[PDB]
Amino acid sequence: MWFEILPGIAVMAACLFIPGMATAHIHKFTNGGKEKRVAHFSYQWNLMERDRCISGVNRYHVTKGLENID
Amino acid sequence: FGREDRFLNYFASMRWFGGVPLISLGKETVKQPVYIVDVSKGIINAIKDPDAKGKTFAFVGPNRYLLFDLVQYIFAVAYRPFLPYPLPHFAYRWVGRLFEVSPFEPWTTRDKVERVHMSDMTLPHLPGLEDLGIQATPLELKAIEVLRRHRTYRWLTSEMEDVKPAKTVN
Amino acid sequence: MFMINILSLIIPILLAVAFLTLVERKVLGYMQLRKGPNVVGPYGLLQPIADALKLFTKEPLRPATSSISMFIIAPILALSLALTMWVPLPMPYPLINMNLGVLFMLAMSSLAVYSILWSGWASNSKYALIGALRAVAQTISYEVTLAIILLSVLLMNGSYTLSTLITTQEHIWMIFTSWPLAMMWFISTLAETNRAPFDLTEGESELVSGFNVEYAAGPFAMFFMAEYANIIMMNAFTAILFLGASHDPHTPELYTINFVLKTLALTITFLWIRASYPRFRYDQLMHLLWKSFLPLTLALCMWHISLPIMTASIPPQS
Amino acid sequence: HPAAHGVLRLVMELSGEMVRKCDPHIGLLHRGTEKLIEYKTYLQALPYFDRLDYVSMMCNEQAYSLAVEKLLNIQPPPRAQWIRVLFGEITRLLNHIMAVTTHALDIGAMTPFFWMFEEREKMFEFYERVSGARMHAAYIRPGGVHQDLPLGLLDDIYEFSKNFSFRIDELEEMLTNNRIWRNRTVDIGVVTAEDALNYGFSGVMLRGSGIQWDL
Amino acid sequence: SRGEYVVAKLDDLVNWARRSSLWPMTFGLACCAVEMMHMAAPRYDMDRFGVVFRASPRQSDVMIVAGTLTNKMAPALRKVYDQMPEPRYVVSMGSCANGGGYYHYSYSVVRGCDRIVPVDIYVPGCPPTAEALLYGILQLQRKIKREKRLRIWYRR
Amino acid sequence: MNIMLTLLTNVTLASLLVLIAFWLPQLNAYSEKTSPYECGFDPMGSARLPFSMKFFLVAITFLLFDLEIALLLPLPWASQTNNLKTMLTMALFLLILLAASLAYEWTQKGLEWAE
Amino acid sequence: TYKFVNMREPSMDMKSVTDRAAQTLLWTELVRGLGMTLSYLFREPATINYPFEKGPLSPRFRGEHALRRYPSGEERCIACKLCEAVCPAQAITIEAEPRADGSRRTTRYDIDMTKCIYCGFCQEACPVDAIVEGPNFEFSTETHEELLYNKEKLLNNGDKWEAEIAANIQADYLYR
Amino acid sequence: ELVQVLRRGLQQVSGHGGLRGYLRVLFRANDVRVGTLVGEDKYGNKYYEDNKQFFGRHRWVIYTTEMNGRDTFWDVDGSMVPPEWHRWLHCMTDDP
Ligand SMILES: COC1=C(OC)C(=O)C(C/C=C(\C)CC/C=C(\C)CC/C=C(\C)CC/C=C(\C)CC/C=C(\C)CC/C=C(\C)CC/C=C(\C)CC/C=C(/C)CC/C=C(\C)CCC=C(C)C)=C(C)C1=O
Ligand SMILES: CCCCCCCCCCCCCCCCCC(=O)OC[C@H](COP(=O)([O-])OCC[N+](C)(C)C)OC(=O)CCCCCCCCCCCCCCCCC
Ligand SMILES: CCCCCCCCCCCCCCCCCC(=O)OC[C@H](COP(=O)([O-])OCC[N+](C)(C)C)OC(=O)CCCCCCCCCCCCCCCCC
Ligand SMILES: CCCCCCCCCCCCCCCCCC(=O)OC[C@H](COP(=O)([O-])OCC[N+](C)(C)C)OC(=O)CCCCCCCCCCCCCCCCC
Ligand SMILES: CCCCCCCCCCCCCCCCCC(=O)OC[C@H](COP(=O)([O-])OCC[N+](C)(C)C)OC(=O)CCCCCCCCCCCCCCCCC
Ligand SMILES: CCCCCCCCCCCCCCCCC[C@@H](O)O[C@H](CO[C@H](O)CCCCCCCCCCCCCCC)COP(=O)(O)OCC[N+](C)(C)C
Numbered sequence A: 001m002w003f004e005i006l007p008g009i010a011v012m013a014a015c016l017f018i019p020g021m022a023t024a025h026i027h028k029f030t031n032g033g034k035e036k037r038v039a040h041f042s043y044q045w046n047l048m049e050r051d052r053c054i055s056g057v058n059r060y061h062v063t064k065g066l067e068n069i070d
Numbered sequence B: 001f002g003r004e005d006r007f008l009n010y011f012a013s014m015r016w017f018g019g020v021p022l023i024s025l026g027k028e029t030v031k032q033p034v035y036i037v038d039v040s041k042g043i044i045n046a047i048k049d050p051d052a053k054g055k056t057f058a059f060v061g062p063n064r065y066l067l068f069d070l071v072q073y074i075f076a077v078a079y080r081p082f083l084p085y086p087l088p089h090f091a092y093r094w095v096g097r098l099f100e101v102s103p104f105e106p107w108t109t110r111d112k113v114e115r116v117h118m119s120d121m122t123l124p125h126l127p128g129l130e131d132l133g134i135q136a137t138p139l140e141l142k143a144i145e146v147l148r149r150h151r152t153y154r155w156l157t158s159e160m161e162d163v164k165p166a167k168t169v170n
Numbered sequence C: 001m002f003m004i005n006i007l008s009l010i011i012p013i014l015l016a017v018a019f020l021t022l023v024e025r026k027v028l029g030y031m032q033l034r035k036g037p038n039v040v041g042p043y044g045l046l047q048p049i050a051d052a053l054k055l056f057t058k059e060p061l062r063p064a065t066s067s068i069s070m071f072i073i074a075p076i077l078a079l080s081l082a083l084t085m086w087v088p089l090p091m092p093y094p095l096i097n098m099n100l101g102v103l104f105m106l107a108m109s110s111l112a113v114y115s116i117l118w119s120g121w122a123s124n125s126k127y128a129l130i131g132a133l134r135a136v137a138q139t140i141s142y143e144v145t146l147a148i149i150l151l152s153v154l155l156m157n158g159s160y161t162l163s164t165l166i167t168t169q170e171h172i173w174m175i176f177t178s179w180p181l182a183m184m185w186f187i188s189t190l191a192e193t194n195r196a197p198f199d200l201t202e203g204e205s206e207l208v209s210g211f212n213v214e215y216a217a218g219p220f221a222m223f224f225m226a227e228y229a230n231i232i233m234m235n236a237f238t239a240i241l242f243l244g245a246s247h248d249p250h251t252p253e254l255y256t257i258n259f260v261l262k263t264l265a266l267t268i269t270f271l272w273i274r275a276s277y278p279r280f281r282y283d284q285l286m287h288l289l290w291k292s293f294l295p296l297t298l299a300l301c302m303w304h305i306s307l308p309i310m311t312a313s314i315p316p317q318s
Numbered sequence D: 001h002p003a004a005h006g007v008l009r010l011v012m013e014l015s016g017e018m019v020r021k022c023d024p025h026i027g028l029l030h031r032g033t034e035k036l037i038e039y040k041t042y043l044q045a046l047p048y049f050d051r052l053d054y055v056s057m058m059c060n061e062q063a064y065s066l067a068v069e070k071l072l073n074i075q076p077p078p079r080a081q082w083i084r085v086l087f088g089e090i091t092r093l094l095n096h097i098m099a100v101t102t103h104a105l106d107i108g109a110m111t112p113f114f115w116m117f118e119e120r121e122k123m124f125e126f127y128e129r130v131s132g133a134r135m136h137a138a139y140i141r142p143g144g145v146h147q148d149l150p151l152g153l154l155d156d157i158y159e160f161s162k163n164f165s166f167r168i169d170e171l172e173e174m175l176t177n178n179r180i181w182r183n184r185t186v187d188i189g190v191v192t193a194e195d196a197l198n199y200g201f202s203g204v205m206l207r208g209s210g211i212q213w214d215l
Numbered sequence E: 001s002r003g004e005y006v007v008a009k010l011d012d013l014v015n016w017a018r019r020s021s022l023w024p025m026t027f028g029l030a031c032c033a034v035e036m037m038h039m040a041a042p043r044y045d046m047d048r049f050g051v052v053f054r055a056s057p058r059q060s061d062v063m064i065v066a067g068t069l070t071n072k073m074a075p076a077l078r079k080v081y082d083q084m085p086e087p088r089y090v091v092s093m094g095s096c097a098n099g100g101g102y103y104h105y106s107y108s109v110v111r112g113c114d115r116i117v118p119v120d121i122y123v124p125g126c127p128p129t130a131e132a133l134l135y136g137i138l139q140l141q142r143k144i145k146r147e148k149r150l151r152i153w154y155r156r
Numbered sequence F: 001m002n003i004m005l006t007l008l009t010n011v012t013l014a015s016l017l018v019l020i021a022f023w024l025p026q027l028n029a030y031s032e033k034t035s036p037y038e039c040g041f042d043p044m045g046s047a048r049l050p051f052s053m054k055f056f057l058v059a060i061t062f063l064l065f066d067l068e069i070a071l072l073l074p075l076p077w078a079s080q081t082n083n084l085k086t087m088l089t090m091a092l093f094l095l096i097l098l099a100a101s102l103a104y105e106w107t108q109k110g111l112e113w114a115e
Numbered sequence G: 001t002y003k004f005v006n007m008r009e010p011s012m013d014m015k016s017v018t019d020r021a022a023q024t025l026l027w028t029e030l031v032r033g034l035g036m037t038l039s040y041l042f043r044e045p046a047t048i049n050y051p052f053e054k055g056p057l058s059p060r061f062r063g064e065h066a067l068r069r070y071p072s073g074e075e076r077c078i079a080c081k082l083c084e085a086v087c088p089a090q091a092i093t094i095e096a097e098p099r100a101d102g103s104r105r106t107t108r109y110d111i112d113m114t115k116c117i118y119c120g121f122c123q124e125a126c127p128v129d130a131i132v133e134g135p136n137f138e139f140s141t142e143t144h145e146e147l148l149y150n151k152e153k154l155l156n157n158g159d160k161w162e163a164e165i166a167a168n169i170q171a172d173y174l175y176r
Numbered sequence H: 001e002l003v004q005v006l007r008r009g010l011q012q013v014s015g016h017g018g019l020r021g022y023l024r025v026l027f028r029a030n031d032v033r034v035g036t037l038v039g040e041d042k043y044g045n046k047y048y049e050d051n052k053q054f055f056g057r058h059r060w061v062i063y064t065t066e067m068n069g070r071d072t073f074w075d076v077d078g079s080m081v082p083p084e085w086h087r088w089l090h091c092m093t094d095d096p
C-alpha cells in the first residue's frame, strides 16, 4: 500500500538532515562551542580582529573579561 | 588490414601521443599489407581446392610500400596532421616495454615494435591469392573503410579519390 | 575542517538525489495504481544504487559528429553548479554566509542554463538542437518573471541574506503575507527546473529524449543528478523563502528538521504535479509568463514597494 | 519514435518548429496480407483480419464475416448476432480507451493511461474466457460465432459495465475542463465538412466536423 | 585464490546491477506491442522489477523486438540496435519476430529478427501474454546473472 | 577563499566522475554505433544548418527587460533613504515605463511568433 | 438520434463571471485534478506479485501444444493430416506410414512454434482430440532452434501436462 | 486506527515463524502476507489462499529452495509449479 513509499522518504530525509546538523556541529567545534561569528560589515570584522588580538592565542573566540583587565 | 584490424588502427591511433615515432624514420621498412576479405576468401578457396592439400601459401597485397610512405598515406586519409620523428631502436623498445605492463589489452609491445620495424619477406616460390583465384585488393580501394572512423567531423564526408595514392616500391 | 564540511554538504545531497529518484518512481506508481520498485531491495531501497552502478559501468560513446570538448564540459558544468547552489542555504547555518545570497543563486542558475545549450549544440543532432532552443525560450520567460518576483518578496525582507529571511519569518509566514507571489514563484520554479508541465528541453513525446539524446552511460547520469539536485535545491529555497521555520540558537536541530520536512513536502508536490498534468507547448509557456504572469508581477512589485512605505513597516537594513 | 506508433516515418520540413509539410512514409509494416489471403481459404483468412487493426479485433472479424455471409447467402442465428453486437461494443470500448489514453500520453498525461489500461485488462479477461486468446480471438466467424458463452460471462460483463462509468468520469476529471488539455487540443487540426467528405474521412473525423453520419 | 574470489565478487556486483536495472527502448512494431503496454500496465507492473522504458537508444540496454519486421524496416532496426551502447540485449517477442509468423511466406517480411540482430531471448506466442513476456524478461535477468566477464578476464 | 575551495571541490568531483565514466567500462566503437541519431534512418541534412527562430523579437525585448530588472534590483536598499517620496516616485516611474513597453509591444503584436 | 458534445454557452450574470474569474485566477480545476490523483494514491494498487501470483485463466486458453494418448497409452493421432490442412500458418509438418502392427501412425509430426499463430484450429479440426493447445504459456527459450518442436517433444509435453489437459478438456467439451 | 494496522503488521511478523522467517519471505518473495495453507506439492512448494484479497491476489505460492537439482533459493521460475497446482493457481478451477 501507500505506506511503502515512506522508507524511501525516510532515507531522503535522513540524507537531508546531515548537511545542516554537520554544519552546526562544525561551526560550534571550530568556534569554542559557540555560534560562528557573523561578520557582514567592516565593524563586525574589526571587532573579530580585536578579539583575536586581545586573546593572546590568535583566536577570536577565546573571550577575555574582567579577570583579564584586572 | 580491415575494419577491426590492428595495422591501420595501430598507425592511426598514434595521433594521441603527439607525433609519430618511427625507427630510422620508417625509411628502412618495406611492407605489403593484405586485405581481410581477400584473406578469408583465400582461406575458403583453399578448403574447396582439391590440389592444395599439403601446401604452403603466401597471402600478400599487390603493392609494396615503405613504412614512411604508408603511414603518411594513412594520416592523409584520416586527415590528421602527420608529424613523424625518428626514435632510436633502444628507446622504442623501452617505450614498448612501458606499454606492456597493462593487465588489459596492451596498446603496444616490444614484439609489436619489432614486427612493425621488420620488412615483409619476399617469397616468390610460394603460391598465392592469384593461384587460389583471388585478385588482391589494393589498399587504396579499402583504406577509407577503416580510416573514415578516425576522421573528425570536418573531414568525415570527404570522398575516396580525394587523397593521392602513396608511392609504391615495386 | 572546512573540507570536511564541504564533503558533509556534497555527499548527502547526492544520496538524497538517488533516493529522490526512487521516491518519484514509487509515488508515480501509487498515483497510477501501480507499486513502483519493490523487488531490488527492501521496498526497492537498492534501486538507485543498481541504476547508478549500471550507468557508470556502461559504455559512453562520443558521436562522430559531436564537438568533443563541449560534449564533455556540459555535464561537468551542470553537476558542478548543482552542487554549488547549496552553499549559501541556511539550514540554519549556511556553509558560506554571503551578504547577497539571493543574487548568487540567480547568477548561478543563469549560468547552469548553458549546460543544456552546450550539450545540445555539441551533440550535433537535430533533436538535440531543438531541445537546446526550447531551453533558450524557456529561460527567457522564466528568468524575467523570477527576477521580479524575488525582488518583491525580498523587498518584504530588507536585504538579500537568507538568515535575515529566517529572522523575518520568525513570527508568521511570507506565504501568508504574499501568497500570489508564492503561486507565481512555484510555477516559475517548475519552469526553471524543467519539470512537468514544462519539461520541454527533454520532451520524450515530441523529441526522442530532447537535448541529451546522444548522451549515454556516465555523462547521462550526471545530467540526471544535476536535474534532481536542482529540484531539491529550488524546493529548499522556496521553503526558506515562504515557509519560515522557527529557530532556536541553542538547539539548531529543530530548524533543520522543520526545513527538511518542508523541503520534502514541496518536492513531493513537484512529483504530484508531474503525475497530474499534461505538457505545455513552449510558445504557450512563453505566452503564459509574458501575457499573464508579467503584468501581475509588475503590479505586485509596485504594491510591495509602496506597502512598507504607506504603513511604516520598512525592514531594517541589517 | 514514441509518438510515431512504431512504424511511421514522417519526413517533415520545419521552419524552426513550424511544420511546412508532412510527408508520411508507410509500408514499414506492410506484410502482404492481401496476397496471403488470396493463397488461404475463407476460414484460414480470418486471423489475418484479426491482425489488421489489432485494437478492434472482433470488429475486423465481424466485417469479414458479414462479407462472406453476404456472398454465401446465409444468415447467422439471433443469439450469434447479439453476441456479435455485444462483443463489438466491448471491442469499441477497448479501442476507445486505447485511443484516448495514447493520445493523452503523447500530449503528456500518463495516469489515465494506467487506469484505463487496468480496465482494458479486465476486458481482455472477457475475451480470453470466450475464446482462449486475450486479443486475437478468431471468435466471430462466417455463420455465427465459434463457441457459446461460459456460464458466468454475462454476470461478469454486467459487473464490469456497472463499474465503468466511474472510470470514464475519473478520466474526464483530468482532461475535459483542464486548461492545459484545452490549450493543447482546442483549434488544433480543424477540418471542414466538405474537406472531410472529399478526403474520404469516416467516423469520428466526420462527426467532429459536424456530419450526421453513422453506419 | 584471493584474486579469483575478488573477481567473482566484483562480477557478481556488476551483474547484479545490470540485471536489476533494465531499460528497454520504446520500440514496438505491431500487435505484440500492445501486450508490452499491458506488461507496463498496473496489473503486471514492470517498473516494479527495475524495468523502465527509455526513448533514446543511447540510454537503452534491452531491445524488445515486438512485432513483424519488414524489409523496409530492417535497416532502421539494425541502426537503432547499433546505436545502443554495450552491454546490450535482445528479446524477440512473438511469432513474427521469432520466425516469420503468420507472414513467413511473404515477399515483404524478414523471417526472424535474428537474421538482422543477435537475439538473446525468444518469447513465443501470437501475441505472448503479458505474463509470458514477463517470464521472458526474468529469464533474461537470470541469463545476465550467469555472465562471468571478470572471471573470464582473470583466467585470460 | 572558501568559495574558491568549494568551486574547486565541485569541479574536481564532476571531472572525476567523467573520468571514471570514460575509462572504467569496456569500450567498443565503430562507425555505425557513433553515427548521429535520427530515429533509425540517416539524416538528410546537417544539424549545423540555420534554424529559424520564430521569437527573435521576444529575445531582444528580453534583453531590454533584463536590464530593467537590473535597474530594479537595488530597491531594498533604496527603501532606507530619507527621501522616501522621491524614491517611491522614481521606482513607480521605472515600473510604469516597463509596463508601457509591455503594453506597446503586446498591442503592436510583438509577442506573436512569426509564421 | 444524436447529441451535441460541445454546444453550451456560459451564463453572463455577474456571479457566473466572478466564478469563472476566480477559476482563472485561482486554479480550481487544476486543484481538482490534483485531488483526483491523490485519491488514486490512497487507493490500493492492482499489481499482482508475479511470479508468486498468476493472472486468471480459463479452460479455453491456448498455450503450448501437446500430443495426447488414450488411457491405454496408445497415441490418439492417426496421421489424418486435417490439422496440417487447416493450419493457417503452415506450421505443421506430418509424415506417416503403417506401423509394425499395421497401425496408421505418424513418423514425423513437427510444429514450428515460431510460425504458429496459436489460433487453435488444429484442435478444432482433430477428430480424436490428439493435438491440443495446452495451458502452458511460460516456455520461452534462448535459441531459435529450441522452438522447432518435433514428435518426441510434443509427446513429452502431453505426458507432462496430461492431468491439466484432461481437466480442461473435461471442463470445456460440452461447449464444443 | 493506526494501532490496529500496527498490530496486524506485528501479527504478520509473528505469522511467519519469527523475525528470520519474516525477513526470508520479504527478501525472496517481496511480500509478507499470511494466508491459509491450501497444500504442498512433492517438490516443496507451498500454496496459500486468502479470499478477502481482490481477485488475482487471493492465491499465491512460495517456491521451494531446491527443485530437482537446482538451488532455487533466489532463482525461482514461474514454471516450477507442477501442472495440477498450475491449474489451481491460474484459476482454471476452484478445486485444489
Ligand atoms: C513504442 O510504442 C510504445 C509506447 O508508445 C510510446 C508506450 O507508451 C508503451 C507503454 C509504456 C509506457 C506507457 C511507459 C510510460 C511511463 C511513464 C512516462 C512514467 C514511468 C516512469 C518513468 C519513465 C521515470 C523514469 C526514471 C528513471 C529511468 C530514473 C532512473 C535512473 C537513475 C536512478 C540514475 C540516476 C541516479 C544516480 C546516478 C544516483 C547517483 C547517486 C550517487 C552518486 C550518491 C553516492 C555518492 C557518493 C559520494 C558515494 C559514497 C557515499 C557514502 C560513502 C555514504 C555511505 C555511508 C554510510 C554510513 C551508509 C509501449 C510498451 C510501447 O511499445
Ligand atoms: C588525467 C587525470 C589526472 C588526475 C587523475 C586523478 C585520479 C583519477 C581517479 C579515477 C580513475 C578513473 C579510471 C578508472 C578505471 C581504472 C582503470 C584505468 O584507469 O585504466 C586506464 C588504462 C586502461 O587501458 P584501456 O584503455 O584498455 O582500459 C579500458 C578499460 N578496461 C579495460 C579496464 C575495461 O590503463 C593503463 O593505461 C595502464 C597500463 C599501462 C599504460 C602505460 C601508459 C603510459 C603513460 C601514457 C602516455 C605515454 C606516452 C607519453 C608521450 C610523451 C612522453 C614525454
Ligand atoms: C584554491 C582554489 C583555486 C581555483 C579557484 C577557481 C575559481 C574560478 C572562478 C573565479 C571567480 C570566482 C572566485 C573569485 C575569488 C574569490 C571572491 C571572493 O572573495 O568572494 C567572496 C564573496 C563573499 O560574498 P559577499 O557578497 O557576501 O561578500 C560581502 C560579505 N563579506 C565581505 C563579509 C564576505 O563571495 C561571493 O560573493 C560569491 C560569488 C561567487 C562568484 C563566482 C563567479 C564565477 C563562477 C564560475 C563557475 C564555474 C563552474 C565550473 C565550470 C567547469 C567547466 C568545466
Ligand atoms: C487564497 C488562499 C491563500 C492561502 C495562503 C496560505 C497557504 C499555506 C500553504 C502551506 C503549505 C505547507 C507545506 C509544508 C507543510 C509543513 C507542515 C508543518 O511542519 O507544519 C508545522 C508548522 C510548525 O513549524 P514552524 O515552526 O515552521 O511553524 C511556525 C513558524 N513560524 C512561527 C516561525 C512562522 O506549522 C504550524 O504548526 C503552524 C502553521 C502556521 C504558522 C503561522 C501562524 C499562524 C497563522 C494562522 C492563520 C492562518 C490563516 C489562513 C488559514 C486558511 C488558508 C486557506
Ligand atoms: C556510483 C557512481 C560512481 C561509480 C564508480 C564505479 C562503480 C562500479 C564499481 C565496481 C566496478 C567493477 C569492475 C567493472 C569494470 C568493467 C567491466 C568490464 O569492462 O568487463 C569487461 C572486460 C573484459 O576484458 P577482456 O580482456 O576479457 O575482454 C577483451 C575484450 N573483448 C570483450 C572484446 C574480448 O573486463 C575487464 O577488462 C576487466 C578489467 C578489470 C576489472 C576490475 C577493475 C576495476 C575495479 C574497481 C574497484 C573500485 C575502485 C575503482 C573504480 C572506480 C570507482 C572509485
Ligand atoms: C542520520 C543517520 C545517517 C543516515 C544516512 C543515510 C544513508 C542511507 C544509505 C542507504 C540505506 C538503504 C540501503 C540499504 C538497505 C538494504 C540493505 C539490505 O537489506 O540489503 C541486502 C544486501 O545488503 C547490501 O549490500 C547493503 C548495501 C549498503 C551500502 C550501500 C548504501 C550506500 C550507497 C553508497 C555506498 C558507497 C560505499 C560502499 C559501501 C559498501 C539484501 O539482502 P539479501 O537478499 O539477503 O542479499 C543476499 C545476497 N548475498 C547472499 C549474495 C549477499
Ligand SMILES: CCCCCCCCCCCCCCCCC[C@@H](O)O[C@H](CO[C@H](O)CCCCCCCCCCCCCCC)COP(=O)(O)OCC[N+](C)(C)C
Binding pocket: C018, C039, C040, C046, C048, C049, C052, C053, E006, E009, E010, E012, E013, E016, H027, H028, H029, H030, H074, H075, H076
Ligand atoms: C550509489 C552509489 C554506489 C557507489 C558504489 C558502491 C556500491 C555499494 C554496494 C552495493 C551492493 C548491493 C548488494 C545487492 C544485494 C543482492 C540482493 C540479493 O537478492 O541478491 C542475490 C545474490 O546476488 C548475487 O549473488 C550477489 C549480488 C550482491 C553481491 C555483490 C558482491 C558483494 C558486494 C560488495 C562489493 C564487492 C567487493 C568484494 C571484495 C572486492 C540474488 O537475488 P535475486 O536473484 O537477484 O532476486 C530475485 C528476486 N526474487 C528473489 C524475488 C526472485
Ligand SMILES: CCCCCCCC/C=C/CCCCCCCC(=O)OC[C@H](COP(=O)(O)OCCN)OC(=O)CCCCCCC/C=C/CCCCCCCC
Binding pocket: F089, F092, F093, F096, F097, F099, F100, F101, F103, F104, F107
Ligand atoms: C508612460 C507611457 C507614455 C509614454 C509615451 C512615449 C511616446 C509614445 C511611445 C509609446 C510608449 C507608450 C505606449 C503605451 C500605449 C500604447 C499601447 C496602446 O495603444 O494601447 C494601450 C492599452 C489599451 O488597450 P487597447 O489599445 O484597447 O488594445 C486592446 C484591443 N482589444 O493599454 C494601456 O492603456 C496601457 C498603457 C500603459 C500602461 C501604464 C499606464 C500608465 C498610467 C500611470 C501614470 C504614468 C505617469 C508616469 C509618472 C509615474 C509617477 C508615479
Ligand SMILES: CCCCCCCC/C=C\CCCCCCCC(=O)O[C@H](COC(=O)CCCCCCC/C=C/CCCCCCCC)COP(=O)(O)OCCN
Binding pocket: C175, C180, C182, C183, C184, C186, C187, C197, C238, C242, C273, C277, C288, C292, C293, C296, C303, D179, G024, G025, G026, G027, G030, G031
Ligand atoms: C488589499 C489589496 C491586496 C492587493 C493584492 C490582491 C491580489 C490577490 C488577488 C489576485 C491574485 C491572483 C493570483 C495570481 C496568480 C494568477 C496566475 C494566472 O495568470 O492564472 C492562470 C495562469 O496560471 C496557470 O495556468 C497555471 C498553469 C500551470 C499549472 C500547473 C501547476 C499548478 C498546480 C499546483 C498548484 C500550485 C500551488 C502553489 C503553492 C505555492 C507554495 C509556495 C491564467 O492563465 P490562462 O487561464 O491560460 O488565461 C490567461 C489568458 N486568457
Ligand SMILES: CN(C)C(=N)NC(=N)N
Binding pocket: D001, D002, D003, D004, D005, D006, D007, D102, E028, E029, E030, E031, E033, E034
Ligand atoms: C507501437 N504501437 C502498437 C503503438 N500503439 N505505439 C504508440 N506509440 N502508441
Ligand code: SF4
Binding pocket: D051, E030, E031, E032, E066, E067, E068, E093, E094, E095, E096, E097, E101, E102, E125, E126, E127, E128, G117
Ligand atoms: S506474433 Fe502475432 S500478435 Fe505478435 S506482431 Fe505477429 S501477428 Fe501480431
Ligand code: SF4
Binding pocket: G083, G086, G087, G088, G089, G090, G091, G092, G111, G115, G116, G117, G118, G119, G120, G121, G122, G123, G133
Ligand atoms: S494453433 Fe493455428 S497456427 Fe498453431 S499449429 Fe494450430 S492451426 Fe497452426
Ligand code: SF4
Binding pocket: G076, G077, G078, G079, G080, G081, G082, G083, G084, G094, G122, G125, G126, G127, G128, G129, G130, G131
Ligand atoms: S488432426 Fe489430429 S489425428 Fe489428424 S493428423 Fe492432426 S493431430 Fe493427428
